[PDB]
Amino acid sequence: PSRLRKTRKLRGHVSHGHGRIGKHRKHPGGRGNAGGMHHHRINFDKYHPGYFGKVGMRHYHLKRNQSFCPTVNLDKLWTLVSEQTRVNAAKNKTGAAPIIDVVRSGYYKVLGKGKLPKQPVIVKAKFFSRRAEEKIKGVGGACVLVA
């Protein structure tokens, strides 16, 4: 909406909001990211630190799907199964332990961040974390691997 913009209140003022002493010239600093090392150094150092130089090893033919590994935390682990699976193990008495298959939900690694509810589980996953496996033993449960 032009009728809401700022160039509709700027009709009648000579410099159109841009200065009498210093005009609105075209490119009074160069175009783009020019002068990153010479006359825009205070800005490229106060606001984009580390923008100049190399670091690390190159990797020519990088394919972003060899390193695919989406993780799920223990806090929201019990959200992969339905609700009548977590409560059925509550009402359960024969000690049976529901099998939570994670790679079926779409995660490969299991990281252990949250607390767990006191009931056994059988977590099938591709990769496990040390703590994610200890928080599962400490509640009673098995960490199955699936290639």
Binding site: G12, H13, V14, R20
Partner: protein, 128 residues
């Protein structure tokens, strides 16, 4: 037989003349409509002595008597008969002004109604 208002207060206006534009006299391209002069060396917007004046907000009219014609009535454009009944419960404080386009056949049957309704018309002898 004039249709008096409810109350006719004293109307006082802080200024009567129009606010002419700077240098609207030396030229014909510069109309009389006001434009706040924004030039650097301008003598009008520095408020020099004896120059043209500027429309401050100080010149505002008393709210009690703002928009009020010299007949103690406010006004209303009326495009047809039906827009009078809107005005029949504001009788003694507002008036009617039939539009410029309402032909004389309708304007006669508009002044006719406003006469019964006692609504005052500012241009009742308009077209004929």
């Amino acid at each position: 037989a004039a249709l008096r208002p409810l109350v006719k207060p004293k109307i006082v206006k802080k200024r009567t003349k129009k606010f002419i534009r700077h240098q609207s006299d030396r030229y014909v391209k510069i109309k009389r409509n006001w434009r706040k002069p924004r030039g650097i060396d301008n003598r009008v917007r520095r408020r020099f002595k004896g120059q043209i004046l500027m429309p401050n907000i100080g010149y505002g009219s008393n709210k009690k008597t703002k928009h009020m014609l010299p007949s103690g009535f406010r006004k209303f454009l009326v495009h047809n008969v039906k827009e009078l009944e809107v005005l029949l419960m504001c009788n003694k404080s507002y008036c009617a002004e039939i539009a410029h386009n309402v032909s004389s056949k309708n304007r006669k049957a508009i002044v006719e109604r406003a006469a019964q309704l006692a609504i005052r018309v500012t241009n009742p002898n308009a077209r004929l």
